[PDB]
């Protein structure tokens, strides 16, 4: 009983019709559930037994399917409806990989910034470097940290904002954590960004330490 | 030759399982007990359990909340504490008991595991993030628990502000950043302030 | 309402017991389940338990390490996890299951509590203590886990040095103090530096003390 | 079984004979144990069954008694001996209040210092004031914090060093932790010490809060 979901990523605009499909390796009859999870929130049940809708679910959400193939449809996608969706095998309680639904938009290159460690923080004994991507679409981005010629990962923690309502863009904050002794040993610091809108890697740096 | 484990920070009303693993002797043939010493106080016996788990005894004050168990196959001892409270803050020792002269004496002891019951609260440390179109920000860095409120210019700055979601560091402390898009011309003439409020620590900060 | 508790930091190879408390519904009549989601990953079903504990189901991967129990008198259910690993870092939700159309669905969910499996390491923040006998010192603060070793002048200064035992702060981080008694005259002509080593973070900080 | 230990605190010099006594509310025959705990170390069994010495224990330690009264005697107190001692009722495994043994010496007055918060710490957003008592006997001492001639209660931490081998004196560090906002609001900051060697309470203060 392996559960597959399609599409893995979907981009839609308000007023469009969105369709997610979940295929089961073998027939599960109508024992298929659909859930909605918004970023950083607990899941919500939409449909149960393939076609039956839960209370509090907008009627624009519709369920269909029998046997192996099932479908979830949002008739008039709204800003509220953009979230991550899953299919679960009701009897076996097996969840699907999930589908992320975000607003459709033209590719926008990120605006890169690199902020050096603050003199206030350096006195404490710890130094943290921040690389900022401000307004880009799609969300997918590759951030690399190189100190002097090369640095590897394991020191970096990343954070991405949720898509903006007005501009439909994402912003990313990558923070590199270093010790005072280790930071002052090296002079150059840099971060490299890669993204569909970026034809060539954008790398911004500062020289002190 | 007794090593202890399971110590850490517990919320008031929480639960924790302490463990004591034995080496160099037959754990299966020897009785065991648990003793605790609160900071700057005397030692207090907690529980005793037989080598076969046949006989088990507890302290009256720790009634209904503590349970002792052991698996001789793994040569391990266990203390399960529930409904934990501040009075239970102490270093817990596991010790081997020996029956000599129709009495029970503790001859082996463990180094100890520290259990402290309190709500963790750390105030945030705010650091500046300054660089035609420019970006500046604030870094809240280490704090606990999560909720932190960031505003710029006492709420004057609006859409340019993007406050990123908190990330948990290796320190066990949450850290977030707040950025804002501003005119490059304003860098020389205007000052931008970030108001970070962390109510658990009752802290209100203005920076830059 | 489903209220959860027990989430927090767990040392690799440790054990943790989660709790979920019920309100507003007949806890004894309804089935309950546990679900987890790793950071930046999809939802994963963990375990299910019957209303009377007659039927208990686990995920095959974590069957021997995870245990599910419930106390309907307390309107609470519990998950005991042992030999915890990095893969177990996730937010654990408790949800109620309801049988409709001869199938089970989860209609009520809990907010969730985060379980993160890792060894806590922060590192020290060293601050100077600025002053014919004068007193100098350095303040190791907000450092985890113990130990921390303080030296003065790379081991040259051992007279008058009194490194105090560490105190656990409300932050859950240890703080120690190191002082040294020196001639007041030397403050103008001599440099005093405090060498702090924290091997858990492998952090070495040297801070010079100068009069205020 | 209720048991009492006397003396609660005792001071001796190397080469002395030290006597500690444990009393029982009812007759306990020979079911009495004696332990010693050095600072920051696990308890150690010295005497079991009232009179029997544990293996590896110096012979100078001696146990005696039957019924209600028991005695632990150290014939030749040595530097290693100086530690805290407990008596446990063997049958009920109930411990006594405890007895502290420290090196005896002449009363010495503490040298008080007060260290203002470093600006480096204030940049982070935290303010720490430290008051340092040094080289004083007996260990008992009281430290009070005053800001605007106003006493502080729950914002103080104290840490005492172990007795020094060479001079048998103590030292204590009291720390007042405040928010950056709190420190700026007030001007004066002081710590008041009172101790046997101090005929009058000693107060050290600074301004520019």
Residue numbers in the entry:
A (entry chain L), D (entry chain l): 1 to 209
B (entry chain h): 3 to 133, 141 to 217
C (entry chain H): 3 to 133, 141 to 221
Quote the study's own text.
Although the Fab-GP interface in the 25.10C-pfGP-TD cryo-EM reconstruction contains interpretable amino acid side chain density, we also deciphered the 25.10C Fab paratope using X-ray crystallography. Initially, wild-type 25.10C Fab obtained through papain digestion of immunoglobulin (Ig)G did not yield crystals. The weaker density of the Fab CH/CL domains observed in our 25.10C-GP cryo-EM reconstruction suggests that the presence of a potential flexible elbow joint between the 25.10C constant and variable domains could impede packing of the Fab into a crystal lattice. To restrict the number of possible elbow angles, we introduced a single residue deletion coupled with a bulky, four-amino acid substitution to the heavy chain elbow domain (ΔS112 and S113AST116 to F113NQI116). Crystals of 25.10C-FNQI grew in space group P1211 and diffracted to 2.6 Å. The complementarity determining regions (CDRs) for both the heavy and light chain of 25.10C had clear density and could be completely modeled. Interestingly, a domain swap occurred between the CH domains of two 25.10C Fabs, resulting in a dimer that comprises the asymmetric unit. In contrast, the 25.10C dimer observed here is likely due to the elbow mutation and crystal packing, as no evidence for a Fab dimer is observed in the cryo-EM data with wild-type 25.10C Fab.
